[PDB]
């Protein structure tokens with residue numbers, strides 16, 4: 001395969017074209033985890049993870065997403081956010097430019113892998129959830145919403161160092177059996193009910209669900225379908241008042257909550273029986289229907305549950321992410337031109 005210094009191989013029904021420095025590429029799974037490989041970067045002298053962006057320029061929207069992806073990754077450099085160690089393309093020119101590769105640190109596990117293998121002591125959950133909220137605070141202070149925070153988006157290594165993997169970046173990758181795979185267990189109810197004007201607080205609902213799962217070793221709201229998902233949420237938090245319902249759903253999705261029987265809020269002391277009362281208290285500031293009332297990531301880091309790790313001076317905010325570039329309309333060849341330069345510019 002042309003392009004000096006590059007080599008080809010078939011990995012998960014796709015050809016991978018990588019520089020000679022990337023050695024021993026090993027697929028992580030099939031389908032969803034199928035565009036990600038382990039490798040060893042001979043130049044960096046370390047294990048890395050490599051991601052092959054599927055179809056970055058299939059259409060305007062994919063090209064815009066590809067660009068945003070790169071732009072956010074290198075804007076949001078943080079101890080608890082996944083960082084780019086490299087970007088490349090087998091392209092010899094922009095006519096050849098049709099695929100993008102992202103090389104980061106190898107963490108080697110996610111929160112599912114962790115819940116599955118350990119029991120997860122209260123003290124272990126404090127450290128993990130601290131680092132998630134810390135990464136999130138930074139992400140939020142830039143004006144970015146994840147919107148799909150879940151255990152497979154949160155990476156953890158042996159040293160229990162945690163990194164948030166993406167920013168709700170989902171685009172042209174496999175969405176056959178891999179979107180059927182995409183779990184709704186961690187999604188904010190206001191997103192579930194297609195409220196158009198949600199904010200940062202959607203991710204705090206998700207952290208709530210993630211933290212509850214770490215403590216109990218099982219999913220909090222494991223819905224089997226869309227109605228079941230809402231029914232399970234409402235059975236724990238209680239059905240909202242009409243006034244709260246009016247600001248967490250689109251007009252049409254209200255029916256889905258109005259046709260349920262009125263249910264009181266359950267006592268979280270009994271749901272999370274022998275958990276640290278501090279864990280229970282916090283969860284109750286997270287698993288709130290009124291997105292208004294939900295604690296922010298900043299306020300949460302301040303909770304006594306994280307008093308072991310809270311250091312206000314080591315919990316940075318970011319500069320606003322500038323969207324002036326993405327505010328203007330461009331063609332596909334332009335988003336391409338722009339992404340090519342972004343790929344080319346990398347260290």
Ligand SMILES: CC(C)N1CCC(c2cc(-c3ccc(F)cc3Cl)c3c(c2)N(c2c(Cl)cccc2Cl)C(=O)NC3)CC1
Pocket residue numbers: 028032033036037038049050051082102103104105106107108109110152153154155156165166
């Ligand atoms: C199913 C969806 C939700 N998705 C979940 C995340 C997957 C995922 C993506 C990325 C990633 C992210 C950004 C980027 F620029 C480049 C890369 Cl490679 C990494 C990992 C996993 N892992 C990893 C884990 Cl966490 C467990 C096992 C094996 C591995 Cl390689 C890392 O170690 N770090 C990088 C991709 C698919």
Ligand code: NA
Pocket residue numbers: 314
């Ligand atoms: Na530090």
